[PDB]
């Protein structure tokens, strides 16, 4: 990760954890930290304090490898972006003053998605090129970036909560037939390609939410947060309801 060496990069942490660190640091204006985006591939989130209030700016990695905040100037990397904004606010509520450096003994938190994608890329390369040992190791380094998107967009298909073929009726039959604990969910594809449904049980009642991908290829429940992959959507909604009646808890297996 291009930002792993930055003392103010916290890795894959939540907004809550990020705000906790900024609070414990004094809540000074311009105080900021960088964390890995939980919604996009290779993105970051700039978290800063101003007027005793938190501001979170998602940083997207452009196709050409640069990084930029929505409507902002692109930069060749996360460090250069923070350096630029230290000098010129250029749209932010205030310039970046004083990085919230990681406390001694605290390292950046590894992302679960990155960790799982590693295994998947290895397996894909091994099955396709029939390589092993150092040979496999060299190949994964050479192929990883090229097959990255492919593995990420299809990662959901390997998760327990994904059901390749379930109608609304069958989905309800599975959710109702069990412990019926709040947050029990499953993801299923719909007839029209590009659309899926999130079905969860809350208060002995099953809710179904439509998920569709826009022209940009991003997924979302109508009027909701957008994600690069279905895996990220589900994982995000496990942390916060973000509009849902209740957040995702237990996965309803195969």
């Amino acid at each position: 990760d291009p930002a792993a060496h930055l003392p103010f990069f916290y890795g894959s942490i939540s907004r809550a954890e990020a705000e906790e660190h900024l609070k414990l640091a004094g809540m000074a204006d311009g105080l900021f930290l960088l964390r890995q985006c939980l919604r996009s591939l290779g993105g970051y989130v700039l978290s800063l304090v101003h007027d005793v209030r938190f501001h979170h700016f998602p940083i997207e990695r452009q196709l050409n490898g640069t990084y930029a905040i929505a409507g902002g100037k692109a930069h060749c990397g996360p460090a250069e972006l923070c350096e630029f904004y230290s000098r010129d606010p250029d749209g932010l509520p205030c310039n970046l003053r004083k990085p919230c450096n990681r406390p001694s003994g605290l390292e950046p938190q590894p992302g679960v998605f990155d960790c799982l994608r590693d295994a998947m890329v290895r397996d894909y390369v091994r099955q396709t090129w029939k390589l092993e040992g150092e040979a496999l190791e060299q190949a994964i380094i050479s192929q990883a970036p090229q097959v990255e998107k492919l593995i990420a967009t299809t990662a959901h298909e390997r998760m327990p909560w994904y059901h390749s073929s379930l109608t609304r009726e069958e989905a309800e039959r599975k959710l109702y037939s069990g412990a019926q604990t709040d947050g029990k969910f499953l993801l299923r594809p719909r007839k029209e390609q590009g659309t899926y449904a999130l079905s969860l049980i809350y208060g002995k009642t099953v809710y179904h939410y439509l998920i569709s991908q826009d022209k940009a290829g991003k997924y979302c429940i109508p009027e909701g947060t957008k994600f690069d992959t279905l895996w990220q959507l589900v994982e995000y909604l496990k942390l916060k309801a973000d509009g849902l009646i209740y957040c995702l808890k237990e996965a309803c297996p195969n």
Binding site: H55, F57, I69, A70, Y209, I221, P222, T225, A241, G243
Partner: peptide, 19 residues
């Protein structure tokens, strides 16, 4: 299409953008 539930827009997580 069918009877799908809507998001309670009042509980959505807000992200900032440049002004």
């Amino acid at each position: 299409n069918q009877l799908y539930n809507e998001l309670n827009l009042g509980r959505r997580e807000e992200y900032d953008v440049l002004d």
